[PDB]
Write an enzyme that holds these catalytic residues in place. Structure first.
Site, mmCIF file in Angstrom:
data_model
loop_
_atom_site.group_PDB
_atom_site.id
_atom_site.type_symbol
_atom_site.label_atom_id
_atom_site.label_comp_id
_atom_site.label_asym_id
_atom_site.label_seq_id
_atom_site.Cartn_x
_atom_site.Cartn_y
_atom_site.Cartn_z
ATOM 1 N N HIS A 49 47.207 33.646 47.983
ATOM 2 C CA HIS A 49 46.726 33.004 46.763
ATOM 3 C C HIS A 49 47.866 32.662 45.846
ATOM 4 C CE1 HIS A 49 47.273 36.634 44.479
ATOM 5 N NE2 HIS A 49 46.317 36.434 43.593
ATOM 6 N N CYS A 103 50.938 36.455 40.275
ATOM 7 C CA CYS A 103 50.710 37.683 41.035
ATOM 8 C C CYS A 103 51.984 38.193 41.707
ATOM 9 C CB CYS A 103 49.644 37.428 42.110
ATOM 10 S SG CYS A 103 49.211 38.881 43.107
ATOM 11 N N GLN A 121 37.883 41.166 43.482
ATOM 12 C CA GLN A 121 36.896 40.750 42.502
ATOM 13 C C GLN A 121 35.889 39.782 43.125
ATOM 14 O OE1 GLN A 121 38.469 40.150 38.402
ATOM 15 N NE2 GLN A 121 40.498 40.347 39.346
ATOM 16 N N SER A 144 41.328 38.161 36.370
ATOM 17 C CA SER A 144 42.783 38.106 36.471
ATOM 18 C C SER A 144 43.367 36.802 35.938
ATOM 19 C CB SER A 144 43.199 38.251 37.930
ATOM 20 O OG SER A 144 42.948 39.565 38.381
ATOM 21 N N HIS A 147 42.743 31.211 40.313
ATOM 22 C CA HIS A 147 43.358 31.312 41.635
ATOM 23 C C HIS A 147 43.191 30.034 42.451
ATOM 24 C CE1 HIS A 147 42.039 35.458 40.534
ATOM 25 N NE2 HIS A 147 43.036 35.889 41.288
#
Length: 153
Positions: A49, A103, A121, A144, A147
Site C-alpha cells: 500500500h 507508512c 482496519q 490511518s 490508502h
C-alpha cells in the site's frame, strides 16, 4: 454479473460509461470481467500500500514528517495524483510507495506481507479481499489516512 463490488456507472457532468468497485473504490474504463461460481474470496492475501496521512489521522506523524499538517482534502488530491501517475505509466506503484508513503512499510516498497481477515482496519481489509491478484484499489479511507492498495498475492 460482474465480480464482487463491481457496477457499471456513468460520469456525471459528463456521460462516459465506466466500471466502479464499491468495495475497493477502483474506477476503470475496462469491463472488469469477460463461468466460475462458488469461488468466494481468498482466505489470505498479500498486499502493498501507499498511505497518505493527514492532520486528522489517528497518528498524524510519519517517517516523512514529524507532524502531518495536510488536510484530508489535500491528502485525497495527492492520492488521486499518484493513482493517475501509476495508470498513465509515468510512475510505478512500488517506486511511489518507497518515496511517498507515510507508512513505515515504505522501506519494503509498500509491502505489508500476507494477512487474514481480522488483521487490518475494516475498509482496508474489505478492499484487499475484494481485489483480485494484481489489482489496485482506488482511494480507501481508514482511521490511518488514505490508502492505495495493490494486491500482489
Amino acid at each position: 454479473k460482474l465480480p464482487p463490488g463491481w457496477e457499471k456507472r456513468m460520469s456525471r457532468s459528463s456521460g462516459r460509461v465506466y466500471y466502479f468497485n464499491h468495495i475497493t473504490n477502483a474506477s476503470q474504463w475496462e469491463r472488469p470481467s469477460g463461468g466460475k461460481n462458488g469461488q468466494g474470496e481468498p482466505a489470505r492475501v498479500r498486499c502493498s500500500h501507499l498511505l497518505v496521512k493527514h492532520s486528522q489521522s489517528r497518528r498524524p506523524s510519519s517517517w516523512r514528517q514529524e507532524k502531518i499538517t495536510r488536510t484530508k482534502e489535500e491528502a485525497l488530491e495527492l492520492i488521486n495524483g499518484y493513482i493517475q501517475k501509476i495508470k498513465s505509466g509515468e510512475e510505478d506503484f512500488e517506486s511511489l510507495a518507497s518515496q511517498f508513503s507515510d507508512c513505515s512499510s515504505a522501506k519494503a516498497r509498500g509491502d505489508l506481507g500476507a494477512f487474514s481477515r481480522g488483521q487490518a482496519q475494516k475498509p482496508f481489509e474489505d478492499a484487499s479481499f475484494a481485489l483480485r491478484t494484481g489489482e489496485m484499489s482506488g482511494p480507501v479511507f481508514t482511521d490511518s489516512g488514505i490508502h492505495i492498495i495493490l494486491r500482489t498475492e
